[PDB]
Structure formats: C-alpha cells, structure tokens
RNA sequence: CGGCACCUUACGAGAAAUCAAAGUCUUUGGGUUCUGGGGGGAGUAUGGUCGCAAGGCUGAAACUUAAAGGAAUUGACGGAA
RNA sequence: GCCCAUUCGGGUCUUGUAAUUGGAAUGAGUACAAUGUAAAUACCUUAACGAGGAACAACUGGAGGGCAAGUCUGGUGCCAGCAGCCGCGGUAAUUCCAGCUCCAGUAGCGUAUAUUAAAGUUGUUGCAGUUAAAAAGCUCGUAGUUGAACUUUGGGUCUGGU
C-alpha cells in the first residue's frame, strides 16, 4: 500500500490542497475562519461583556447534584443579546440585586455548559463596578447603591 | 562498546547464531547450543572437545533449522552427501 | 532458608556462576528467584501502580489487584513484575519475585563520541504492547531521561542517564505502557552495530562445564 | 522612535508544576545555596539549558570544522573563566554535562560562605544584601553574582563599613553613645 | 501456469475477533484515487443542481452533550439447544 | 555525637526552641549638602534620624483525586454552596462556610477569552478507512500524479595536499 496520499516528487499542490480540504473537518479551524464567535456567540469573540440584569432566576441543575443555582438573565449591551450568567459563591446573587450593571465573562468551556447549570455559559464578574468576589470576602466594600 | 583507548565496556557480548547471524538475546528461550564431539580414529569421541554451534530461536520456530545444522556440519566438515548446495 | 531445585540455582549455590553476565550470555532460565537477588545484591525495587482488578460474580465481585513492580540498580539491568492478588502485600511480593526473575540486560551505548562512561541507549530502539509504543532514542549527555514518569522511573533503574522517548498510543495503560519499554531495552541487545560483525568463540555453558556439581547427588 | 530595548523573559517555569520529587530536590538545592526562591534554580537552569543546547548545535557540526572549533573553544573558555568547568575538563563533550549545584556553587552567594568571612549560608547572603563584601573594591550586594574564581581570592570584606573596619556602625555607636551619657 | 477456497506458529499484524494478508510501519517513504476527524443536532436548514414525481447528488450552522462507540472478560439473563 | 554506658551524670563537643536579653549593621523611609539637569525631579554619594513583634507587618490562591498539601475541629445536612473534569451535599461532609495548621508561587498570584505546545486529535516528516468515523455499488476516463531495464566501465603512471 502506497498509502492514500500522492508521495511524488511534483505532488504538491494537490497534497496542499487536500490538506486545506481537510481543515474545514477541524471545529476549531472552521470557528476561526468563519467568524461564528463575531456573528453568533453573543459576546463579539471578546473575554468580556458588560450587560443589564433583567432579573434574577434560579435555575435548577442537570441530575446527580440537585439544587437552584441562582443564576441571572443579563441583557448585553454592546449587541442587545439576553443571555443567563451564574452567580458565584454564597448569597452573591443578593449582592448583584435587579437591573444592575454586571460585568460577565466566561464560564471556562470555550462556550458550552459549565458542568450541571445547563443552559448557562457565564460569570458574573463585576456588578456596578466591584468584583463578587471582594464582595463575599468583605475585603473591599460595596459603593453604597 | 571501547571507550577511550579499549576498556571494553558492555558486557554480556552476545553469542550470534551459527546459521544466521542473528544475535541471540539475553531471554532468547528457545536458542540452543549443540554441542558435536570431536571425531577421532577407529571409534573414538574424544572427552572434552567439541564443535560448538548456537542456533537463534527463529530458525527453530520456523523448521528451517535443523537443515540449517546440517549445511553448518557440511560446511565444517561433519558430514558427507548429507546437505546438497543446490536443491 | 536457602535450598535450590533447578541445576542453574544449584551451581549458583556453589559459587561457580560470577555474575549474572554468564548466564546472559547462555541465556540460562531463571525460574527460581533467590539466584539473582545473589548475583545482584543492589537491586531497587520500585511500585509503579495498583489497579484494583474485579471479575463479577452471581453475588458481588471479586476484587484483586494488579500490582506493577519496576526493579533494578544502576548497572544496566531492569526487570518488570506484574501480578494480580488479592492480598495487597502479597501481591507486590510477587510482582517482585517476577521482576527479579525477568532481570534483563541493557546495551547502554555513546550519544556521539566515547570520552568517558555510557548513560545512553545505543541505538533508536522500540517495543510495542497492545496500542502502547514506546520509542527510546538516545540522547546527549545531560539531557536527562525525558519521559512519561513511570518511563523515567524504569529508565532510572536501568541506569540509562539520558534518553529522548516517543511513547504513543494509549500511555496511560501505564502496565501496557511499561511493558513496551522493557520490550524497547530489550531489543537494545539483539540489534546487531557493526562493532559485534566480529565473530565470537562460543564459550562452553556453565551448565555443561560445572554438570558434576550441578543436578542432585 | 529610538529602538525597542530589548528584554528576554530568561528565566524559565518547568513545563509541569507539581513533580513531587522534582520540587523535593529544588528545595534541598536551596536549602545547600541559601535561594530566596525556586525562581533563581528556574533561571539557573535555563542558563545552563542555553549552554548545553549550544554544546548540541556544536555537536551536530564536525569538531574539526571551523564555527564549531571557534565558537564551542570559546564558550568553554568562558565556563573555565567562570569557574563552573574544570581545568581537566576543557573538550566541549564535559560542559555538555554541568549540572545547575556546580553553577550554583560559583556565587558570591557560596563564595563568601565557602572562603569563611560569613557563617551559615543565610548570613553571608544577608552581609552581601547590607552593604558590605567587595568583589574587588566596588561593593556587590547581588547574591547571584558568579564569582570570576580569577577574582575569587580578591573577595574581601568592604573597604567601608564594619568587618572590614573602617567604622563600627550604627548599634556600636549608640552604645557608645549610651556609655558616655553613664 | 490460473479464479469464485484449510492448519500451525507467528518472528510479520492487529485493541481483539482474528489475518498468509488486515504482513514487509516509530527499523516510520513501491505507485495512485478516493474517503474520515467526539457524539448528536443532520443527511436536516438553506441554496445549487438533477428529476414526471417519489427522491437523488451536493451539503451548514446555531445549539447541545461527557461520553457515542468498538472489541472482548466475567457474570446475570433468554417463551435458545 | 558520646570519655565511660557498677543506675545516674558531667554535656568536656555540636544543633534547634523562649513576649528572654545584649551587643554589631541595614535601607525602605526622611533629610542638610554635593551630584544630576536646559531647569528640575529620580538615580548613584553622603551627614543627621531612623526596628524588636504593637512592627519600618506579604499577598494570592489551594489543602479527596487529576496535582504539591488536613480522614483536624464546628457550622451545614440535596441546602448554601465548591467543582475546568472527576465530582462532593441527603445528620459521621478531609470537596461548602470559619480558626489552626499546612501546601504552592512569591511582589507577585488568580480568573476570562484567544492562541502555541501537548495534538501522530490535520499526519510532508507522521494518522486512520474488515468491524471504532472512514473504500465512491461498479467499470470507463481528460487533467493531474507517477512509470521497467540499456549507452564510459574498469586498470596503470606520476603528482599537490591533511
Ligand atoms: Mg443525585
Ligand atoms: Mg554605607
Ligand atoms: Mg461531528
Ligand atoms: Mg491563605
Ligand atoms: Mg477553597
Ligand atoms: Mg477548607
Ligand atoms: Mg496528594
Ligand atoms: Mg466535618
Ligand atoms: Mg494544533
Ligand atoms: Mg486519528
Ligand atoms: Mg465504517
Ligand atoms: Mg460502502
Ligand atoms: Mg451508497
Ligand atoms: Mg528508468
């Protein structure tokens, strides 16, 4: 067996573009080139996007581990999208409150689901300009409402 | 294998089969030495010489080896009419 | 408590098999394992891993445990012991025993020019167990032992100092995995440089040499 | 508009973190050479590292050939010079094989604590942070100097300052100080 | 000499069933075409094109999910023997 | 470590712990000066003051595995939460929330998204296609890609080097 591919010596072009043929099976490379973060995804393929709270929803996780994860439906501001983002550690959402300015990121994935929050794909970072994090510690304070 | 100026290192210097090369291994469990004593006049087996000959593993394995043996022996000059050149 | 069954062991007792260098070299079976912990009184003996093992049952399973010993020193001698019990110690014991029994040579070869002593493979050697490739190429000097851990480990015990490895394949059937870097170092002795195109004597055995002393009385 | 200043990021993470055996041998590496952190046996290492991937590169040309001849007998110069490699052991093939304790060893770190003037590691880093020992007689406060070995015999106390003994120094003169207002 | 075909060892292979090719592959390169890149969403949407139609060829993404598979091992089971 | 170990013990020699205490520096701060400088700052240089746990105070993350390090104590009791993944939670939590310990990195360390490595999971080097995804149902066939062996081999005679 010559094994598939063409082992000439003037083979080139065709070994190129058989290879190029074949990236488009790649998910990753065909995400790259055609944009699908930039015209989908709601945040723009950025890390970061500021959005509304709507309001504060729990939602209850996928199966083994049961409970309501206290999530928020956000409204990103820069596309108009609405989009759910988890709410971190103890209480924290109460901290976030109702049509606050909140600062998302990413839940890890690359997209997709985090673990049993199904239909969730964001942190809640910074709401009104804070940290959740500072807030749960108390090492920095909240600027009042 | 000769550092420097000589100083054999690696030791365990392998015996290599009679018939085909083949370096016989360490746990080479189905090479064989044959030992062929040394002929003499009028009866005669002479105590403590012999032709030695190792044979590697996959020539047994294979069946090729006894044939292998005997074109050894011919070549030695063990044997006569027993191992053609031709076949 | 000594006592030997097999003429290699007995001859062993007496005093008239050195090192286990000879019985390399006539490829003389070990089934017993006291022979090698005589020959070769350094010998480490490292655990790889336990995997507990189940069959099933009519009621519940049946769990063992498949205990992966790597042995050696640091003269160029390794052996690999696999045995699955249910006592754990137990197991490991055997493992053990298997590693010494198995205790196999290393041709430990120049990353490029002689100068002073040997902590490379000779040449690119591999082995293969299952879908487990373990590729060893010899390095330069220094370099270390760069490997899968357990790889490392065995290379260490070896007493290779530096080599370059390719492990492909599932490596994390570390067993598997192990088993095809034994194979690897052993193929070292048995591919053929032109430094042996040199014929050899063929030296009588131990075995036939030493037979009065060996077999029972 | 003038030119970017260049910079490396030299000194270089091992590639896993938690190699239990590895972090071991790093902290009796420290322990021997008094380290404030991983950090320096990471950039000595890296500094090593360069040093056998040259040896390599000169490796892979024929000795005998004319950049390998030049360049490898000039760095193995410089190791000598150093301190690092010996004087037996000046064939290329040798540095190839230094390891990072030898490296460490050549400090001015160790070279206080190996030629007395300190007591105990720690201390002699701590009398170099301070002010005092002069390599020549302009005052090094670096532990990971790398002593010249050339200039390892001119390691002094500081010309200035006490041990050395110029002046006493601070504590001495408050007592002093004390003594007199008694 | 030719196509529609068993046994052992495999040193050759192979994840193994097995394979005299599914061998001469980490000791990696005889010459070529074609196809595949976790599962689903989906042979769908869309556009093309081909058709009397039914359908065909061509062929997505969003979104979703930690398994989907394969081979076998021991079990358990079977209105199998 | 031990001169000796009729029981001790000196402790002749070397190391670690105590809000003991004591002498010796220190520059981080400040600050005449002088340096710098276009003028300044800041640096380097100095006088003078400035360290003893109350400071002249190191944070970040983690402490089941992957993966370095707690079967510690309470608070909780499918909750609230952690958890990249595996997963932990249902009155015995080493995974949640606090103290102590402890680990890792250290003036840095985490998170997010990209991206490179790892990925021989894009393969020319270097993958797979009997069954795991994969051989067009079959043959024909232009481009392309490839394509049997054969023409000057061998010997001498000097002559430069390394
Ligand atoms: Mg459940
Ligand atoms: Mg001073
Ligand atoms: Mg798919
Ligand atoms: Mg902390
Ligand atoms: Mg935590
Ligand atoms: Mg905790
Ligand atoms: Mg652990
Ligand atoms: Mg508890
Ligand atoms: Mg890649
Ligand atoms: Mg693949
Ligand atoms: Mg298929
Ligand atoms: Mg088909
Ligand atoms: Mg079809
Ligand atoms: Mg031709």
Same mark, same amino acid.
């Given at each position: 067996?010559?094994?598939?591919?063409?082992?000439?010596?003037?083979?080139?072009?065709?070994?190129?573009?058989?290879?190029?043929?074949?990236?488009?099976?790649?998910?990753?490379?065909?995400?790259?080139?055609?944009?699908?973060?930039?015209?989908?995804?709601?945040?723009?393929?950025?890390?970061?996007?500021?959005?509304?709270?709507?309001?504060?929803?729990?939602?209850?996780?996928?199966?083994?581990?049961?409970?309501?994860?206290?999530?928020?439906?956000?409204?990103?501001?820069?596309?108009?999208?609405?989009?759910?983002?988890?709410?971190?550690?103890?209480?924290?959402?109460?901290?976030?409150?109702?049509?606050?300015?909140?600062?998302?990121?990413?839940?890890?994935?690359?997209?997709?689901?985090?673990?049993?929050?199904?239909?969730?794909?964001?942190?809640?970072?910074?709401?009104?300009?804070?940290?959740?994090?500072?807030?749960?510690?108390?090492?920095?304070?909240?600027?009042?409402? | 294998?000769?550092?420097?100026?000589?100083?054999?290192?690696?030791? =365990? %210097?392998?015996?290599?089969? #009679?018939?085909?090369? +083949?370096?016989?291994?360490?746990? &080479?469990? $189905?090479?064989?030495?044959?030992?062929?004593?040394?002929?003499?006049?009028?009866?005669?087996?002479?105590?403590?010489? =012999? %032709?030695?000959?190792?044979? #590697?593993?996959?020539? +047994?394995?294979?069946?090729?080896? &006894?044939? $292998?043996?005997?074109?050894?022996?011919?070549?030695?000059?063990?044997?006569?009419?027993?191992?053609?050149?031709?076949? | 408590?000594?006592?030997?069954?097999?003429?290699?062991?007995?001859?062993?007792?007496?005093?008239?098999?050195?090192?286990?260098?000879?019985?390399?070299?006539?490829?003389?079976?070990?089934?017993?394992?006291?022979?090698?912990?005589?020959?070769?009184?350094?010998?480490?003996?490292?655990?790889?891993?336990?995997?507990?093992?189940?069959?099933?049952?009519?009621?519940?399973?049946?769990?063992?445990?498949?205990?992966?010993?790597?042995?050696?020193?640091?003269?160029?001698?390794?052996?690999?012991?696999?045995?699955?019990?249910?006592?754990?110690?137990?197991?490991?014991?055997?493992?053990?025993?298997?590693?010494?029994?198995?205790?196999?040579?290393?041709?430990?070869?120049?990353?490029?020019?002689?100068?002073?002593?040997?902590?490379?493979?000779?040449?690119?050697?591999?082995?293969?167990?299952?879908?487990?490739?373990?590729?060893?190429?010899?390095?330069?000097?220094?370099?270390?032992?760069?490997?899968?851990?357990?790889?490392?480990?065995?290379?260490?015990?070896?007493?290779?100092?530096?080599?370059?490895?390719?492990?492909?394949?599932?490596?994390?059937?570390?067993?598997?995995?192990?088993?095809?870097?034994?194979?690897?170092?052993?193929?070292?002795?048995?591919?053929?440089?032109?430094?042996?195109?040199?014929?050899?004597?063929?030296?009588?055995?131990?075995?036939?040499?030493?037979?009065?002393?060996?077999?029972?009385? | 508009?003038?030119?970017?200043?260049?910079?490396?990021?030299?000194?270089?993470?091992?590639?896993?973190?938690?190699?239990?055996?590895?972090?071991?041998?790093?902290?009796?590496?420290?322990?021997?050479?008094?380290?404030?952190?991983?950090?320096?046996?990471?950039?000595?290492?890296?500094?090593?590292?360069?040093?056998?991937?040259?040896?390599?590169?000169?490796?892979?040309?024929?000795?005998?050939?004319?950049?390998?001849?030049?360049?490898?007998?000039?760095?193995?110069?410089?190791?000598?010079?150093?301190?690092?490699?010996?004087?037996?052991?000046?064939?290329?093939?040798?540095?190839?094989?230094?390891?990072?304790?030898?490296?460490?060893?050549?400090?001015?770190?160790?070279?206080?604590?190996?030629?007395?003037?300190?007591?105990?590691?720690?201390?002699?880093?701590?009398?170099?942070?301070?002010?005092?020992?002069?390599?020549?007689?302009?005052?090094?406060?670096?532990?990971?100097?790398?002593?010249?070995?050339?200039?390892?015999?001119?390691?002094?106390?500081?010309?200035?300052?006490?041990?050395?003994?110029?002046?006493?120094?601070?504590?001495?003169?408050?007592?002093?100080?004390?003594?007199?207002?008694?």
């Amino acid at each position: 067996m010559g094994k598939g591919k063409p082992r000439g010596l003037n083979s080139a072009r065709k070994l190129r573009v058989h290879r190029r043929n074949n990236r488009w099976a790649e998910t990753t490379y065909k995400k790259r080139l055609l944009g699908t973060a930039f015209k989908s995804s709601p945040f723009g393929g950025s890390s970061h996007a500021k959005g509304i709270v709507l309001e504060k929803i729990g939602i209850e996780s996928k199966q083994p581990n049961s409970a309501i994860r206290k999530c928020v439906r956000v409204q990103l501001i820069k596309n108009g999208k609405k989009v759910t983002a988890f709410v971190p550690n103890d209480g924290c959402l109460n901290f976030v409150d109702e049509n606050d300015e909140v600062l998302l990121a990413g839940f890890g994935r690359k997209g997709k689901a985090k673990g049993d929050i199904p239909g969730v794909r964001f942190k809640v970072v910074k709401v009104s300009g804070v940290s959740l994090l500072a807030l749960w510690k108390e090492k920095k304070e909240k600027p009042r409402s | 294998m000769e550092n420097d100026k000589g100083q054999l290192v690696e030791l =365990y %210097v392998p015996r290599k089969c #009679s018939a085909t090369n +083949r370096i016989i291994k360490a746990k &080479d469990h $189905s090479s064989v030495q044959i030992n062929i004593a040394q002929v003499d006049e009028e009866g005669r087996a002479i105590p403590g010489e =012999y %032709v030695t000959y190792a044979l #590697s593993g996959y020539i +047994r394995a294979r069946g090729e080896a &006894d044939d $292998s043996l005997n074109r050894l022996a011919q070549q030695d000059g063990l044997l006569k009419n027993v191992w053609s050149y031709s076949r | 408590g000594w006592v030997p069954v097999t003429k290699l062991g007995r001859l062993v007792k007496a005093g008239k098999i050195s090192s286990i260098e000879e019985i390399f070299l006539h490829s003389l079976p070990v089934k017993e394992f006291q022979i090698i912990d005589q020959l070769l009184p350094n010998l480490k003996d490292e655990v790889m891993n336990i995997k507990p093992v189940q069959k099933q049952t009519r009621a519940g399973q049946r769990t063992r445990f498949k205990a992966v010993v790597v042995v050696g020193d640091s003269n160029g001698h390794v052996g690999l012991g696999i045995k699955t019990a249910k006592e754990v110690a137990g197991a490991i014991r055997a493992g053990i025993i298997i590693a010494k029994l198995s205790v196999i040579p290393i041709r430990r070869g120049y990353w490029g020019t002689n100068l002073g002593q040997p902590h490379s493979l000779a040449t690119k050697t591999s082995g293969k167990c299952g879908s487990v490739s373990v590729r060893l190429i010899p390095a330069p000097r220094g370099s270390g032992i760069v490997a899968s851990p357990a790889v490392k480990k065995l290379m260490q015990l070896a007493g290779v100092e530096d080599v370059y490895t390719s492990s492909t394949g599932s490596t994390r059937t570390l067993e598997n995995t192990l088993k095809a870097a034994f194979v690897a170092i052993g193929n070292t002795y048995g591919f053929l440089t032109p430094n042996l195109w040199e014929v050899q004597a063929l030296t009588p055995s131990p075995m036939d040499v030493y037979a009065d002393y060996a077999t029972a009385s | 508009p003038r030119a970017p200043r260049t910079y490396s990021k030299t000194y270089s993470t091992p590639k896993r973190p938690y190699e239990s055996a590895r972090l071991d041998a790093e902290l009796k590496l420290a322990g021997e050479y008094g380290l404030k952190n991983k950090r320096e046996i990471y950039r000595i290492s890296f500094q090593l590292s360069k040093i056998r991937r040259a040896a390599r590169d000169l490796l892979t040309r024929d000795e005998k050939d004319p950049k390998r001849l030049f360049e490898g007998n000039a760095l193995i110069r410089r190791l000598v010079r150093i301190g690092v490699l010996s004087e037996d052991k000046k064939k290329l093939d040798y540095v190839l094989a230094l390891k990072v304790e030898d490296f460490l060893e050549r400090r001015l770190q160790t070279q206080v604590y190996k030629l007395g003037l300190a007591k105990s590691v720690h201390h002699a880093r701590v009398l170099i942070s301070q002010r005092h020992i002069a390599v020549g007689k302009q005052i090094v406060n670096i532990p990971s100097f790398m002593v010249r070995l050339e200039s390892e015999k001119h390691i002094d106390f500081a010309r200035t300052s006490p041990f050395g003994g110029a002046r006493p120094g601070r504590v001495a003169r408050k007592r002093a100080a004390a003594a007199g207002g008694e």
